[PDB]
Write a protein that binds this ligand. Structure first.
Ligand code: HEM
Ligand code: HEM
Ligand code: HEM
Lengths: 721, 304, 719, 83, 84
C-alpha cells in the first residue's frame, strides 16, 4: 500500500534512478584556500549514513511520535521527539542590530607588490601569497528577511585571514558616513529604523523620523546625497565601489606613519538600477542581489575588486580644506589619487549560510601590526561596539572559536572558560608565570608584537565637537556639481519620492530648507515636487566655496567617471512554441561570446518546440521572470511564436517595461510587429531591428555597452506602464 | 551661527510653535483591564531630562568624551559606553516560525453562558469584558519579510481571563500540512529558505518545499488551501480563523464534548489576486500591518 | 632596574610533585574519547602571546594611555578583548549537584550479555568503552565543601559505538520522592532558605525537616543520608546505583527489568560526622583532591557494574513496587550479577572545559535499554536536556568536545547558538535531492525502537496505591545496621534536628520515626529533649518484606569489605627523628599499598639523628588528623621533645583518638601519648620498640578501619 | 560583565537596581524590556519637541572636569609607580 | 490524503479553481529539478483529473493515460462539496 508507505520509515531510495544552486563544496570544490581547508574538518558526508540523535543513536522511525497506541497520547519518554523539537525551537539567534540583511562568499586576496615602504602588515608584503578572505555584503536598515534592492547604503565587510592575525576591513559602498561622533549612532539608527510604535516601514528611509533627524543634523547631508543618488540602488554587489571611510594609519619598519583610506574598485564596473526598477524588483525577487552573487560565482563571473589606498604623509595632515579625521568628508581622488595595490576575488559560495554567513563576526578593532587607528571620533566609538554586540549575537566571548571566525595563524593566550568553550588548555592561565616558563610569551615589537604609534595627545578632557568639523555643506555641493544631469534628476527623484511619504509637512519643509544651502536648483526642484513654495531669502542662501581648488570631481559621478562592463549581464529571450530555432541558437551563442547570459522565458516551463521540430529548454515563465530581472530584452522570430506573444499581456508589458526602464530591446524579423502594436515611439538608439539573428545579436550587445538609454528618459515618463 | 549649534547640546524647543501614533495617543478612551495593568509601565517624557539608566542627567548628547575636541575617545566615558552597550544588545531572536507579525489590543464577550458545554470562566458571563491581545503573522518569512506574500497566516489570541490566560493559537486555514509533530522540523526546513544560500524569502516556490509535498501526500489538503486565494488575504480583518485541532470542553457535570474553534470575520472574507499581491510586497511590504493599524485608528475596528 | 623590569614586558625565561593536567602526568593512559579530545588541546611552549584574532601582543603589563601617567584610551582593543573575555568566564552552575569532580577512564564487559540486551557496549569483552565520570554532592553550590553530609551523585557517560549512554545515579539505592512533580518542592526545601540563603551544604535547617515531616515517602532515603553513607570516605569507596528500574531488551525482543549497581573494588568506607565536619574546614576539596591524587598515584578507582535482573513476569511478585524509586530490591531476594568493570585512570586537562561543561541525561539511552514507567524517571527524562539549554548556552551543547559521541551523528537538525558543524545537504526528511541521506535505520540494523509495553488506564493525576508504603523499607534498613551504625544514624537526626529552630518541626519528625523503630525515635527524642507520649511509643511497626526483616548488604561495616590499600597514614616527625624507623615504616606501608605522609613542624627537609635529610610532606598545622586514616609516631629523642612542645602535634594524637583511628607509637613516642589526657592504650594504640614490627602490627589494626569500641570513652575526651 | 550575568542590557529594570529618580532616555528594546515607551526614540527630534532633553551643567547635567591631557599614546608603567 | 483536497477543489467556483491552477503553476515553475514538478503533478491526478491536466499543461508535462485514469476518492459522508 503506497499511500501507507509514505507515513512509515523510509528505508528505500527517493531520487529518480538549468542546474540548481548548490553548496560551494558541490559546485566549486576546486576553488581552494587555507581557510576553506581549515573549514573542511567541520564538514559532513551523509551518503550511506544512518539518521541519528545528537548522541549518536540510530533512529528507526522519523515519522511518528511515541504514543500510548497508534491513536493515543504522546508519551513524555519520547526523547527522540523532544531532542528534535528542542533543537528546532532554538535554531534562531539574534540578527545584527544594523546590516541584518546580508550575503557572504569566500575568496582570496593578493598584493601586487610589497608595500613594505608604507606598512609592515604581513598581508601586504608578499605578492606570492594568497590571503583567504570572507566577505559579507549587506543593506543597513532592514531586518534579516527584508528585500535586497531597497534604497540604502550597502555594507561591505572583508575578513582577511592573515598569518599575523585576522584583519577586518568593515566598510560601506559610499566614501562618507552620516554622522561625525559615535555617540550619535543609536539616535541616527533609531531614526532610520522602523518607527517604534508600529515598526513601519521596512527597508525604507522614506518616513518621518529619519527625515526629522536629517533636517536637525546637517552633518548627515553629504551621505544623504549619496544614498538619494543611484549609488543607493546598486545593480550588483559586484558593480559597486567600496570604502573604509575612516582615515587609518600605516606604520612601516622605520616607525614612519602614513595616513591612509581604503578603497575597493570593482573590475566589473559601477552600475546601478533606477528607482522604479529597484522597487518592483523587491517585489518579484527580494533575494536578487544575493541570488545574483551566488550564481555569478557558479557561472565563473567571479567578483573581482582592486584594493586601493589614498596615502597621505603625516606632515600633510592639515593641508586640506576639511579634516581627514572627519568621516562625513571624503578625500577627492583628484587631490589624492587611489593607488591600486592589490586584487580580491570571491570564488566560492558557502556550504551552509547560517554556519558561515550568519555567524561571521567582523569588527574595525580587528587590526594587524602595520595598521593603526586615527582619532576619527566615529571610528573610536566603533572599536568598542563590534566585540560588545557579538557577546549576545553569537552567545558569549568564545565566538572566535566558531569555525568561520577562527584565525588561520596561532592564537595562544591566558584567557579561559566562557560559554561554549571549545579549546582545552592545560598550562598556566596567568602571566607572568614560572610554572610553564611564561609561555605563551609577549612578543617584542621587532618580532611582530603589536604596538601603538606614539602619537602626541594634547588637550583638556571635554565633550566638544572639533571646530575643524563644522562644515556640513561644501562636500554635498561638490557631490552635486560632479553629477551628470541624468544623475542629478535621479537625486531629485530620490529626495522627492522619500519626502512624499513624510506625513508631517514641517519635516519636508525643513529638509528642503537644508537643500537651499547645498544648491538652489536642487532645493527648488525638490520643493516643486512637494508643493513647497520657497521664499526669496531661501533662494538667497549662501553656498559653500570650493575645496582645495575643486568645484567638482569626475570620480564622484558613477556614469561619467566609471566604466560599464558588458560581461555577466542578463538578457531575456522571449519565445513561445513555433520560435525559429536557428535564431535562438545564434542569439544565445553571440551573447555568450561576450559573457552575457541569455535566458529563455516562455508561456510555460519545460521545453518549447521550434518551427523546425526541435525542443528548446526554457529557463522560466515570462510571468515568473519580469523585465526588471534582466538587463535587456531580445525577441527572436517565428510566426507562431510572435502571434502567441502578441496575445500575452505579460509579454507585451515586458517590452513596455523594458522600454520605460531605458533598456536595450532587440527585435528580429516579424518581432517588430509586436513592437509596432505597442504605444511606444519610433525605435531609438536602444531599439535594434534586423533579420539575420547573428548580426542582430551583435548590434544588440553593442547597445548593451551603454548600460541604459538615458536619452529615452523623457519620453519614457509619458508611457503607460 | 546655528550650524555650530546643531553639534552642541540642544536646550531649546525643536517643534514649530494625521500620522500613525501609539494607541495611548490616538485611542486613550479604548480601555480594558489588561491595558490598565500596562499603564504603570508607560512613560511621560514631557519636561523630563535626558538621563542614563542610573538616573544621571546628561548635559551633552552630541559628543564623546575626548582628550581635547580633536582627541582620542576616553575609556572613562561611561555615558557613551552605556548608550552604545544598550543599543548593541537591542535585538532578540525572532520567532522560529511566524517571525513576521503585527499585534493589537481588544476585548472579547461571550454571547450567552456556555455552561452546558464548558466551565471555562470567560465563556460564562456576557457582561465580562475579557481583554485580548492578538498577533497576526505570516509563517515562513523572517521578521523583515513582506506582508502580502502567499502563505498561511497565523492568528494567535491571548484571552486574559480571571481563571488564567487562555491562548488560542490558530491559522487562517482549517487544516495543517502534517499529522504528527515529529515531522514539523522537516516540514519547516523544507519551506524555509534553503540552507546553503538562504533563498527564497517569504515563498514556498522552491525545490525543497515541493520535494517534501511530493513525498508526503498528507500535506496536499493545506497545500490546496494556500495555493488558493486563501493564501493571499486582503486584510487580517477579512480572513477566517481556525484552531484546527479538536479540543475538549468539560461542563460542570463532567460531560465532555469535542470542540473545534472558528473565527468568522464581521468584515467578510476577501483576498488579493496573485499579481496584485506580488506587486504589493514591492510597494508596501508593511501593507497588512499598516492596514490593521490604520483601520483601528479610523474606527473600523476588526470584529470577529 | 630589575624592579623596573617586572612592570615591563617579560621576554626572558622565568623558570614531591604537584597535581598536573592528565596529559602531563598520565599520557600513556589512553582511550578513543581522549584521542578525540587531542584535536582541542593546546601547546603554548615557544608560542607568542596573542589576541583571540591571532595578533601578537607586545606589552601585557600596561593599558594604552595618553602618556605614561595618562587616561586609558578606548582604542586599546587588547585590554578590552582581554577584560571582556574575563568578564564573561562564568556560566550557570548546575541547579543540583553543582559541586563535582570528573575523570576519564574505560569500561569492559566481562562476557557478552546478549541473552538480556542488544546494547553494543555490553556485547564484546575485547572492547574498551571510554567513560567520563562526574562525582558530586547535591545541595551545595559550586564552592561548597566536599565532605558535607549529603547524597552523592554518580554520573557515568559511556561513549559507545552505537551512541552515548549516560548512567546518572546516586550513592544510595533509593530516592527521596516518588513523582517528578515534587522535585522542585523537595530541592527548594533542602536548598538554602530563600530569604537569607542559609545554610550552605547542609540539610540541617527548618525547611528541609518541614518537608520530610509532611512527606513520609522521604523517610527511606533520609535514613540513608543520616547514616554514615551520607559522609563517604572517598568517591573510590562508596557504592553506586541507578535507582530506577530500567528495561533490558534482547535480540529476540525479550524484556528483563533491570537495576544498575556500581560496587567499588576499594571497599565501602565512610567518615564519622565530627571528622567530616572538621574536614570541610581544613580541606573543602578533600574528595576532589583525593580522587585526583589517587589517579596520579596509580590507586585507580575501580568499580564493578552489577545488575539485578527480574524477568517481566516477576514484576508483581514483591511486597513493593519495583517502579517505586523510594523502594530498593534487597540483594537477599534479587542478587546483583557483576557484569563488567570500570577503571578511572586519567584526570582532565582543564576542569572547566571537561568537568564543568559535561552534560549527562538519563534519557540518553541506547538500543538494548529502555525506560520503565517509574514516575520519577519519566520526569527526569524531560529535565536534563531542558536544563542544559541555559547552562551550556543553547541546543548545540553536544558539540562541546567532552559531550561529543565517538560514533557518527548525522541528522537534519541545524543552526542554534554556536553551531560548529557545517552542513551542505538536505535539511529535511524525506528528501529526494540527496536521495534521503541520512536514512532511518531498521530495528534489525540498530535503529532504536521502544519496547511495545501495554498501556491500559485512564488519564489521571493519582499516586498508585502500590506506592503507598513509607516505613517498611526504612525499618528494614534500620534493622540491618550494626549498633554503631544505628547510633550514627541517631546522631545524624539529633545533630540536624538540633539546628531546626521551630520545635514543632522537630517533634513532627520524631513522630515519623516512631513508625520506623521505637528506640530510634526514643533515642532521637531524648537527644532533643522531647517527651514521647505512650501512644507514640506503641505506634504500629511494619512487617517483613517477602519474609525479610534484615538485609546484610544494607550495612556498610557488616556487609562490605574494608580495603587497606590506598589509605593514608600521617607520620609525625621533627628534626632528630630516628631515620631507620622512618625507612622501616615507609617500606612496610608501601608493602601493603598504604601512603605514608611525613608531617613536621616546618616544610622542606627534616634532619634525622643519623644526620640524613628527610623530605617533608607538609606541616602538622597544615594537615590535621582528619586528613589521614591513621597516625604513627616514630622514635627519636629530639623529635619527640619538639612534638611535646607543639600544641597541634599533641592535639593530633587526641583528635585521632577521638575519631577512633589507629595510632602507632614507637619507643619514646609513647611518652607523648602518656602525657596527654587520654585513657590507657587499647586495641588501636599500637606500642612497640622495633619499627618494622610496630608498622606490621599497625597495618593489621588499620584493616578494621576504626576502633568502634573506643566510641563511648571517646565522647569524654577533651579534643 | 552584567550583560551576561544579568541576562542583558535591561538589568537596570530589575527592581533592586532601579533608581528612585526619573530616567527617561532614547534607549529601547533588549532582552526582557519591562518599560513601554511611546515617544520618539532619537535625539534631536521634533515630533515630541525633543523630550527628554539634555540638561545644562548648571541645571545638574553631568560634565567631566576639564583636566589637562598631555603625553604620547603609549603602553608604559609610570615611573612614579615603581616603588 | 486525497478525499478532502478533492472536496475542497469541487467546492470552489470556476474562478477560484483557476487561481488554484495559477498557484501550483507559478510555484512549480520556479522549481528547478523537473522530477519534483512531475511528482507534484502526479499527486494532483489523485485529487482531480482536470486540475492535474491544467497544471501539467502550464509546466510542459505530458500526462500519461495511466495517470489520467488514476482513481479519484468518493464522497465524504455523502458530501461531494461544501459551500463554506
Ligand atoms: C563608518 C561608518 C560605519 C560603517 C562603514 C560601518 C559598517 C558596518 C558594517 C558593514 C557592518 C556589518 C558587518 C557584517 O556583519 O557583515 C556593521 C555592523 C555593525 N556596526 Fe557599523 N559601521 C559604521 C559605523 C558604526 C558605528 C558608529 C557603530 C556604533 C558604535 C556601529 C556599530 C555596528 C554594529 C553594532 C554592528 C553589528 C555588528 C555585528 O553584529 O556583528 N557602526 N557596520
Ligand atoms: C496546528 C498547526 C499549527 C498552528 C495553527 C500553529 C500556529 C502558530 C502560530 C500562529 C504561531 C505564532 C504565534 C505568535 O504570534 O507569536 C506559532 C508559533 C510557533 N509554533 Fe506553531 N502552529 C502549529 C503547529 C506547530 C507545530 C507542530 C510546532 C512544533 C511542535 C509548532 C511550533 C511553533 C513554535 C516553536 C512557534 C514559535 C512560538 C514563539 O516563539 O513564541 N507549531 N504557531
Ligand atoms: C533517582 C533520582 C535522581 C538521581 C539519582 C539523580 C541524579 C543526578 C545526578 C547524579 C546529577 C548530576 C549529574 C552531573 O554530574 O552532571 C543530576 C543532575 C540533575 N538532575 Fe537529577 N537525579 C534524580 C532525580 C531528578 C529529578 C526528579 C529531577 C527533576 C526532574 C532531576 C533533575 C536534575 C537536573 C536538572 C540536573 C542538572 C543537570 C545538569 O545541569 O546537567 N533529577 N541528577
Amino acid at each position: 500500500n503506497k499511500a501507507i508507505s509514505t507515513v512509515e520509515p523510509h528505508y528505500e531510495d527517493t531520487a529518480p534512478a538549468v542546474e540548481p544552486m548548490m553548496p560551494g563544496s558541490d559546485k566549486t570544490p576546486k576553488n581552494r584556500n587555507e581557510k576553506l581547508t581549515q573549514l573542511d574538518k567541520f564538514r559532513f558526508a551523509p551518503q550511506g549514513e544512518s539518521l541519528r540523535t545528537n548522541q549518536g543513536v540510530k533512529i528507526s522511525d522519523n515519522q511518528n511520535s511515541l504514543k500510548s497506541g497508534a491513536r493515543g497520547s504522546t508519551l513524555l519518554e519520547d526523547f527522540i521527539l523532544r531532542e528534535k523539537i528542542t533543537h528546532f525551537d532554538h535554531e534562531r539567534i539574534p540578527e545584527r542590530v544594523v546590516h541584518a540583511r546580508g550575503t557572504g562568499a569566500h575568496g582570496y586576496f593578493q598584493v601586487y607588490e610589497s608595500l613594505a615602504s608604507y606598512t609592515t602588515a604581513e598581508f601586504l608584503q608578499d605578492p606570492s601569497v594568497k590571503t583567504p578572505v570572507f566577505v559579507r555584503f549587506s543593506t543597513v536598515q532592514g531586518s534579516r528577511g527584508s528585500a535586497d534592492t531597497v534604497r540604502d547604503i550597502r555594507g561591505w565587510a572583508t575578513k582577511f585571514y592573515t598569518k599575523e592575525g585576522t584583519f577586518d576591513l568593515v566598510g560601506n559602498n559610499t566614501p562618507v558616513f552620516f554622522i561625525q561622533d559615535a555617540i550619535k549612532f543609536p539616535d541616527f539608527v533609531h531614526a532610520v529604523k522602523p518607527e517604534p510604535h508600529n515598526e513601519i516601514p521596512q527597508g525604507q528611509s522614506a518616513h518621518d523620523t529619519f527625515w526629522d533627524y536629517i533636517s536637525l543634523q546637517p552633518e548627515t547631508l553629504h551621505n544623504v546625497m549619496w544614498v538619494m543618488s543611484d549609488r543607493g540602488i546598486p545593480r550588483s554587489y559586484r558593480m559597486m565601489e567600496g570604502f573604509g571611510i575612516h582615515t587609518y594609519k600605516m606604520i612601516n619598519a622605520e616607525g614612519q606613519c602614513h595616513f591612509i583610506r581604503f578603497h575597493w574598485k570593482p573590475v566589473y564596473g559601477v552600475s546601478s538600477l533606477i528607482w522604479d526598477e529597484a522597487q518592483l524588483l523587491t517585489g518579484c525577487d527580494p533575494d536578487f542581489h544575493r541570488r545574483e552573487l551566488w550564481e555569478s560565482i557558479e557561472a565563473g563571473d567571479y567578483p573581482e575588486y582592486e584594493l586601493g589606498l589614498q596615502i597621505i604623509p603625516e606632515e600633510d595632515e592639515h593641508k586640506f580644506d576639511f579634516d581627514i579625521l572627519d568621516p562625513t568628508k571624503l578625500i577627492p581622488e583628484s587631490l589624492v589619487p587611489v593607488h591600486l595595490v592589490g586584487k580580491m576575488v570571491l570564488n566560492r559560495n558557502p556550504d551552509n549560510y547560517f554556519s558561515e554567513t550568519e555567524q561571521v563576526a567582523f569588527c574595525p578593532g580587528n587590526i594587524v601590526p602595520g595598521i593603526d587607528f586615527s582619532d576619527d571620533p566615529l571610528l573610536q566609538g566603533r572599536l568598542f561596539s563590534y566585540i560588545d554586540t557579538q557577546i549576545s549575537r553569537l552567545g558569549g566571548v568564545n565566538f572566535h572559536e566558531i569555525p568561520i571566525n577562527k584565525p588561520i595563524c596561532p592564537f595562544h593566550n591566558h584567557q579561559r572558560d566562557g560559554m561554549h568553550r571549545m579549546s582545552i588548555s592545560g598550562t598556566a592561565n596567568y602571566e607572568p608565570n614560572s610554572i610553564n616558563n611564561n609561555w605563551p610569551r609577549e612578543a617584542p615589537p621587532t618580532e611582530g608584537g603589536f604596538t601603538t604609534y606614539p602619537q602626541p595627545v594634547n588637550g583638556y578632557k571635554s565633550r566638544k565637537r572639533s571646530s575643524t568639523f563644522i562644515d556640513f555643506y561644501s562636500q554635498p555641493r561638490l557631490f552635486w556639481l560632479s553629477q551628470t544631469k541624468v544623475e542629478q534628476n535621479h537625486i531629485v527623484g530620490g529626495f522627492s519620492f522619500e519626502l512624499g511619504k513624510v506625513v508631517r509637512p514641517w519635516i519636508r519643509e525643513r529638509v528642503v530648507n537644508q537643500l537651499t544651502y547645498i544648491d538652489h536648483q536642487l532645493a527648488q526642484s525638490v520643493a516643486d515636487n512637494l508643493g513647497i513654495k520657497l521664499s526669496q531669502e531661501q533662494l538667497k542662501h549662501p553656498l559653500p566655496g570650493p575645496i582645495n581648488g575643486l568645484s567638482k570631481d569626475r570620480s564622484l559621478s558613477m556614469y561619467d567617471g566609471h566604466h560599464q562592463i558588458l560581461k555577466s549581464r542578463q538578457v531575456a529571450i522571449l519565445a513561445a512554441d513555433g520560435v525559429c530555432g536557428d535564431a535562438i541558437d545564434n542569439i544565445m551563442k553571440t551573447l555568450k561570446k561576450y559573457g552575457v547570459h541569455g535566458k529563455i522565458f516562455a508561456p510555460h516551463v519545460g521545453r518549447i518546440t521550434s518551427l523546425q521540430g526541435n525542443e528548446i529548454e526554457v529557463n522560466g515563465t515570462i510571468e515568473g521572470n519580469p523585465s526588471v530581472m534582466v538587463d535587456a530584452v531580445i525577441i527572436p522570430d517565428g510566426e507562431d511564436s510572435i502571434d502567441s506573444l502578441m496575445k500575452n499581456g505579460n509579454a507585451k508589458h515586458y517590452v513596455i517595461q523594458a522600454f520605460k526602464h531605458l533598456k536595450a530591446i532587440g527585435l528580429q524579423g516579424k518581432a517588430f510587429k509586436l513592437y509596432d502594436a505597442l504605444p511606444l515611439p519610433k525605435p531609438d538608439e536602444g531599439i535594434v531591428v534586423g533579420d539575420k539573428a547573428a548580426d542582430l545579436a551583435e548590434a544588440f550587445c553593442n547597445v548593451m555597452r551603454g548600460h541604459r538609454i538615458w536619452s529615452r528618459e523623457s519620453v519614457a515618463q509619458e508611457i503607460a506602464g
